[PDB]
Enzyme design. Sequence first.
Site, PDB file in Angstrom:
ATOM      1  CB  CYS A 112     -69.597  44.903 -96.257  1.00 50.91           C
ATOM      2  SG  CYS A 112     -68.436  43.594 -96.697  1.00 50.91           S
ATOM      3  CG  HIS A 238     -67.537  47.599 -93.320  1.00 47.92           C
ATOM      4  ND1 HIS A 238     -66.972  47.417 -94.564  1.00 47.92           N
ATOM      5  CD2 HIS A 238     -67.477  46.398 -92.701  1.00 47.92           C
ATOM      6  CE1 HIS A 238     -66.585  46.161 -94.690  1.00 47.92           C
ATOM      7  NE2 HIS A 238     -66.879  45.522 -93.575  1.00 47.92           N
ATOM      8  CG  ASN A 268     -64.393  43.311 -93.405  1.00 47.65           C
ATOM      9  OD1 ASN A 268     -65.587  42.992 -93.341  1.00 47.65           O
ATOM     10  ND2 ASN A 268     -63.944  44.250 -94.233  1.00 47.65           N
TER      11      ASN A 268
END
Lengths: 313, 313
Positions: A112, A238, A268
């Site tokens: 990520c 994020h 996500n």
Amino acid sequence: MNVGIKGFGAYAPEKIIDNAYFEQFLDTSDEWISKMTGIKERHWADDDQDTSDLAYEASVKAIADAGIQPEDIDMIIVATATGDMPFPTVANMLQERLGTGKVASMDQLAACSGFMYSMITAKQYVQSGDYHNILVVGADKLSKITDLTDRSTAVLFGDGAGAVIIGEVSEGRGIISYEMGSDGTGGKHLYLDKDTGKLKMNGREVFKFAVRIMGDASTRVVEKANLTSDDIDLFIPHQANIRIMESARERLGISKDKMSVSVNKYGNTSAASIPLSIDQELKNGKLKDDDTIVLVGFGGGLTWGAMTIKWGK
Amino acid sequence: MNVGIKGFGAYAPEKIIDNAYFEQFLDTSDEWISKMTGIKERHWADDDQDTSDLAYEASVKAIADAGIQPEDIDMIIVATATGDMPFPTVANMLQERLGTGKVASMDQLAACSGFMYSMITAKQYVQSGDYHNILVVGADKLSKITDLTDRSTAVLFGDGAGAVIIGEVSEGRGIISYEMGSDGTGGKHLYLDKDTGKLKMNGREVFKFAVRIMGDASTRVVEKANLTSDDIDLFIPHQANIRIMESARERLGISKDKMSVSVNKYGNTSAASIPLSIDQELKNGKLKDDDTIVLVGFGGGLTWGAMTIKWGK
């Protein structure tokens, strides 16, 4: 020199999955999911649509947005934890499919945090002066490595892709500060199970590290950039968990309304998370030239990244 | 500035496999595998030993040879196509396992050319003036993705690792010129079959490409360096196959006794190929300070790279 984003592009698959979709094979509910993650729905790529497919869509737009031809691309870097294959890479595929030159193309893994890492990696080449335009992609098809028997991760991940063209921009704009980090000791808390082929996560462990790193890492890049919470026009973290996000937003100490929130419609999406969110702020006219945005993220590794950049070509 | 290799290390698993081993399940013979590949034997990591383990061994040596401590490492770039998992990355595992700081660490995918890519990536980071000791690794446990029922590639691949610390070298040494390229149209000639999880290779198509690309790219980096096959002390190509190596050497027009050959005892170790061969020349006394060598390789993707680098700390 000033190196920044001279072209941006984002893309999410067409199949939308509502929270009400998991009730059929999991002990979940819209209420629960919304409460626990702030997610309402996520996008999932079709079976015949891999990570390269998303990466390709995101790239084509950033190329047009940069106002350049694919022939002008000096290198391709795809950040992804879910490439179609380890070889050829998604970047190899983008080279042929985008019609670029036979320039160097590679995928760098940092989960990520991957997109910032690649974005920062590209800056390093453009500073060498031998590179003018580098295509940087943040793409992931997590749905294919998500355990649908583990409700805390199953209802958490979605697919998506983001892309930019890193190159020199007008003075005063671009990447001001950044930070990258690793901590191998937390790998056990979030990894891809070698045998099963599915992602494994220890929510509580991951949660505690997430709130801290994203909070502190952001604070660090901001001070490094010598900025005040006044100079921050947008805080784009994020999109991992609304609660993780708010906690970090809180730690940094920034107006609740300066945070980009798109986890509600994408969930996500790992390396696409940040770009997929910048795409929103742009088309909702809330991000404009000369605005200063703060980037921060973290992923399984554990890895982390934080950036400070003034938008503009 | 002058960026080069200030520390070197290489490693290969304890288990050595003889060409005669494959006779129990494949129609082969030592003479046949030799005739076709020039391989005499190769190393295979143990069932409980992964790429991480190989990477680790070379890293320890590479840090010790560099004359530094793990706390001096500023970044960790691991080049592989057979990493333990996409996340955490082999790099993240070294960060910890090496007792290094919480520095940036990621893996880069460019197959057999990844090691060169990564060394260049590190060059760019060091030229910024912010990094000084970047641990770059070339590691692959090709054995876990080799299909033993396909004698074509079953007898070709082996495992191993190579590593170097990238930093500032003395007396105008280090990297002089380089060329990283990519060509996605050849993705069909060498890929990891998703379903099967085994490497698929179209021999002829890769052979043809390899010979041409290695010979041509080598000629370019040398010329870009304003040199001649005369100034080159060692020609160290991806040890993909003895026949592919000679063909390129013939194209480059360099002295037969200048070409480094180690495929005979390692087989094809992908990213580890060139560093594993450099390790042999160092100890056999064929590579010394101020010597000028030429690295060139190619890989699935397709990818290729070539470097001209004067040895020396």
